[PDB]
Amino acid sequence: ARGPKKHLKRVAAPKHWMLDKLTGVFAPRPSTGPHKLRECLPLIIFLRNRLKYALTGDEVKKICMQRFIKIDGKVRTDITYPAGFMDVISIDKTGENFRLIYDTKGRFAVHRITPEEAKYKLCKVRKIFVGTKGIPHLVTHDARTIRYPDPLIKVNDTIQIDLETGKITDFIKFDTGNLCMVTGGANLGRIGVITNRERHPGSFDVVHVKDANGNSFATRLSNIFVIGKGNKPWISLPRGKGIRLTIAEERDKRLAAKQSSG
Template structure:
């Protein structure tokens, strides 16, 4: 019997090996540059039938699943542009600022607590979640646009023993107040980039859930549960005296007795389906 063909090696690989070219397995190690529309994050609120692809966020301070590209915010939310070409014309005029810095990348990843400013129209927005876990177009005043809140993710010593902390938006701040610990919230002055105040992560403070099924809900921390080898649980009670629990990593402190930021419509109180129905009916009756 004759020797059969080698099924493990394709003709193209044989040809490349003769020419001394690299194998095909070495040519696929590059960053993905495309994002299919169906697999895009649902909180972008993109419809399925407007194309096969969605804008892929550039590498930046926020993760792909936790951010919103500027093109989605400008074109799909604010309706200031009809297509990608018009959006690029807007950002290339240096009209859009994120946290006080001009951004000319249409796919720059803006994330939770970021301040987006449009000087030409005098508008300022802060990216926060609604009770359904979606980024909402939340307009803020010029005074509130001068600062942002950030959660402390890591505190450690760097080179030459210099203390520094890392925030949820990838900022690194050297020589912080020694009293600031992990999970605390700091208030950042966007003009200087320095910490002006901070809030301890403790009971009786106001917090927002930034992950899980309760994303976007706001309430007062009642107590915390520690689970060694597992996830620490935080219990929160909202303004309607409804209690819910979430992981400690999903809790973002936003104030002591009062929130340090203005909250979107609903004030972080999640309504049941029946309550939402009754509210819609009341609005409809009042409108007539």
């Protein structure tokens, strides 16, 4: 190509959007923004495919141009805006609040939250650097840059940001025994407690996590997001607490639910 690409084939779209094959040739290409193309959820997909508010792409635009949708407290009229992990979506017309959290299957879930909880979010510290005049700067996973952070905050930590002022309230350090969620890989969407960290100089580090039921797994250090201190999360969790079931016990649960239905 001679420059940036502007389209996205429907079969080449991320598979956690759960698009069907026969609807069209194209998929909504996410706009540039805080989150990556392969790790976001476009506003149109959430607004018509998940919530069933709109039937076509035109109705999504008609909803958005009435300034009804807010993302992290700010009105977004773009229908392909990239919304990502730990983002807050507010609809004041219906008085609804949602937080984008992966379910145990690695897909963004429709997770309703209290309006009190919708005032803050958690962010992962990606970079720490000193700028001009010796002023510290902290860069999070969602492209936020914050000046004068707490001197004890380092990389791979978690900070709580108040969405109205955009300022740090408190933080969680990356230590063994804390609660974390996996944000990528084969264990995406799982929740557990950090057991130990393996350091490989010049390469990727590996972190071992164990869930509430006692199942153990491992990921890379870049795929770990610290949620809470100890066993207590600082956010509300979806229907599944982050425990991944096997296919046999999913079948057993489904059969038990069917038997008790009716």
